[PDB]
Amino acid sequence: EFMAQILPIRFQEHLQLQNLGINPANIGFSTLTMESDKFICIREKVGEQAQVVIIDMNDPSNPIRRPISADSAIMNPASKVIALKAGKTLQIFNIEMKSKMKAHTMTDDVTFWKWISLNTVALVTDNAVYHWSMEGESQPVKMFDRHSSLAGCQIINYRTDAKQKWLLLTGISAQQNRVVGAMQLYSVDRKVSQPIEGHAASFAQFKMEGNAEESTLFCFAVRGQAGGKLHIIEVGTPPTGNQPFPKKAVDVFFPPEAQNDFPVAMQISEKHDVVFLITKYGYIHLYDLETGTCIYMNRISGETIFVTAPHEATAGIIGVNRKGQVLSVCVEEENIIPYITNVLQNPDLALRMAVRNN
Numbered sequence: 001e002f003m004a005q006i007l008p009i010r011f012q013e014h015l016q017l018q019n020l021g022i023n024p025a026n027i028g029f030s031t032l033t034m035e036s037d038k039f040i041c042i043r044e045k046v047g048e049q050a051q052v053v054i055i056d057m058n059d060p061s062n063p064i065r066r067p068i069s070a071d072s073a074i075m076n077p078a079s080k081v082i083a084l085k086a087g088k089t090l091q092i093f094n095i096e097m098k099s100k101m102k103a104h105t106m107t108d109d110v111t112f113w114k115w116i117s118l119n120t121v122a123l124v125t126d127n128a129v130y131h132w133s134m135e136g137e138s139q140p141v142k143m144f145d146r147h148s149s150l151a152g153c154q155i156i157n158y159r160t161d162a163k164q165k166w167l168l169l170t171g172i173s174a175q176q177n178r179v180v181g182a183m184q185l186y187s188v189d190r191k192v193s194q195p196i197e198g199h200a201a202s203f204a205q206f207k208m209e210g211n212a213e214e215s216t217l218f219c220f221a222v223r224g225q226a227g228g229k230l231h232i233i234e235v236g237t238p239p240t241g242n243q244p245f246p247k248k249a250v251d252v253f254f255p256p257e258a259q260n261d262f263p264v265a266m267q268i269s270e271k272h273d274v275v276f277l278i279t280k281y282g283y284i285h286l287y288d289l290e291t292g293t294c295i296y297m298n299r300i301s302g303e304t305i306f307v308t309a310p311h312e313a314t315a316g317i318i319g320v321n322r323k324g325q326v327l328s329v330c331v332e333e334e335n336i337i338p339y340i341t342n343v344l345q346n347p348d349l350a351l352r353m354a355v356r357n358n
């Protein structure tokens with residue numbers, strides 16, 4: 001209780017989507033996308049008519065709404081560009097210039113897709129993953145074939161390292177009354193896949209003390225038969241001159257009343273070298289990227305948070321919950337080291353954080 005009033009985080013509510021004319025039935029994974037902190041896109045069928053709604057997070061009181069039919073709609077992370085699909089037909093549309101950009105017809109249905117950069121869409125079929133540039137004439141390019149361990153899964157995420165050399169596909173399945181995560185880590189250079197049991201993950205770049213060059217880290221969290229675990233590992237050849245990053249493995253805690261909770265989302269602060277982990281029940285956890293030390297845990301949402309993105313300005317995490325609350329969490333930069341000193345009583349981490357300068 002000493003200094004218990006000083007949190008290491010700042011929680012913020014940004015929006016309530018039901019106050020912006022969004023039907024609650026459409027606030028969910030199949031109909032609402034948030035590919036970055038810049039936009040939220042919702043598909044709604046008002047009467048017999050399919051509509052696409054775009055909320056510009058910089059102008060949220062003026063949603064853009066159009067009678068456009070699509071099975072899925074994802075805004076570009078940065079520009080006023082949208083990808084739409086209808087069956088096997090994909091199109092990318094330049095909203096700003098009110099013009100079509102690119103189109104492609106697949107032979108296999110796309111069951112999941114996501115923007116992975118300012119200019120590339122990843123496409124997941126039942127049997128493969130493709131990357132499609134929004135520029136130029138190029139067709140999607142196959143990156144890898146799907147591993148059998150993901151067969152029949154609901155795909156929930158796809159993401160890459162910054163250099164697009166380490167690719168990660170995540171799915172879940174219902175095995176009796178358990179939700180089991182299955183990941184496929186693919187190395188572009190080695191042309192090798194590794195199946196991993198995991199629920200949520202991210203990549204990060206991290207410059208170790210004593211090294212001149214960044215390490216590419218892969219962090220994943222799982223709740224399996226052994227309970228909750230978080231792993232932080234370097235992937236790929238360490239830059240010449242670097243020492244290797246020692247792999248970290250730490251517990252992920254669930255209270256006794258939360259036996260059916262599990263990880264659903266992860267984002268990593270570039271600036272603060274902190275991992276944000278969100279659970280199905282609406283808990284957030286913070287871990288130190290370097291050591292895996294658990295900094296903080298709390299239940300921040302009464303409803304499941306079903307989509308997240310980096311929150312750029314604060315190097316935090318932003319998300320939408322099933323009632324339509326748009327919320328974020330970030331490090332509170334002036335309070336985190338007091339909290340580490342006096343509540344965690346971890347002066348090694350207090351020092352290491354100040355030395356990084358944060």
Ligand SMILES: O=C1N=C(NS(=O)(=O)c2ccc3ccccc3c2)S/C1=C\c1ccccc1Oc1ccccc1
Nearest residue numbers: 052054064066068069082084093094095097098099100
């Ligand atoms: O009615 C329209 N209203 C618009 N306004 S907008 O550009 O600000 C805008 C705004 C929001 C959008 C959301 C999703 C997809 C496109 C959008 C475009 S463009 C248009 C028709 C149109 C124009 C050019 C070529 C074809 C057109 O028809 C379709 C376009 C995409 C999918 C299906 C049909």
